[PDB]
Amino acid sequence: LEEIAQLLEEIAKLLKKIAWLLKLLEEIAQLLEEIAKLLKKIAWLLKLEEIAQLLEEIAKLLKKIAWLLKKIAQLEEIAQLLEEIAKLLKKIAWLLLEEIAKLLKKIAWLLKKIAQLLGGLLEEIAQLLEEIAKLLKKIAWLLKK
């Protein structure tokens, strides 16, 4: 309950940093790995078992994005990976807490927009990530209540 909420607020903090770094692809990749580790902890606490499996799949997808970013420092595939994460978030919302489920679907929508922006604007993506961080912070607030 409260533990999972604290791990969500930590992810939001890491997303806000990523948005600021978008203006150092190597540093963002490291943060995405941290977010994946936090997602693994949330999955462990839940178990329940279905949502945990889906969160683990999202963690691996973020790891793939991180390895893709490290390769760029040394895009279209990242977009497809983000769309997969969105489809997984919507699946988690379908299982869930109606208010929290709606905030997840909204996060999935914004995640789809970021994927679209990757096809073409870096400033817009940073704003989208900050909106997602706010929505995650909101979900954590409902968990503590």
Residue numbers in the entry: 3 to 25, 37 to 60, 75 to 101, 110 to 131, 147 to 170, 184 to 208
What did the publication describing this PDB structure actually write?
The sequences and structures were named sc-apCC-6-LLIA and sc-apCC-6-SLLA, respectively, for single-chain antiparallel coiled-coil proteins with six central helices. As the peptide assemblies were hyperthermally stable, we heat treated the cell lysate (75 °C for 10 min) and subjected the soluble fraction to immobilized metal affinity chromatography (IMAC) and size exclusion chromatography (SEC) to yield highly pure proteins in a minimal number of steps. Circular dichroism spectroscopy showed that all five proteins were α-helical and hyperthermally stable structures, and AUC confirmed that they were monomers. Moreover, DPH binding suggested that they had accessible hydrophobic channels. For the antiparallel α-helical barrel proteins, the seeds, models and experimental structures for sc-apCC-6-LLIA and sc-apCC-8 are very similar. Thus, the success rate for making these single-chain constructs from the seven antiparallel designs test was five soluble proteins (71%) and two new α-helical barrel crystal structures (29%).
Here we describe efficient routes starting from validated parallel and antiparallel peptide assemblies to design two families of α-helical barrel proteins with central channels that bind small molecules. Computational designs are seeded by the sequences and structures of defined de novo oligomeric barrel-forming peptides, and adjacent helices are connected by loop building.
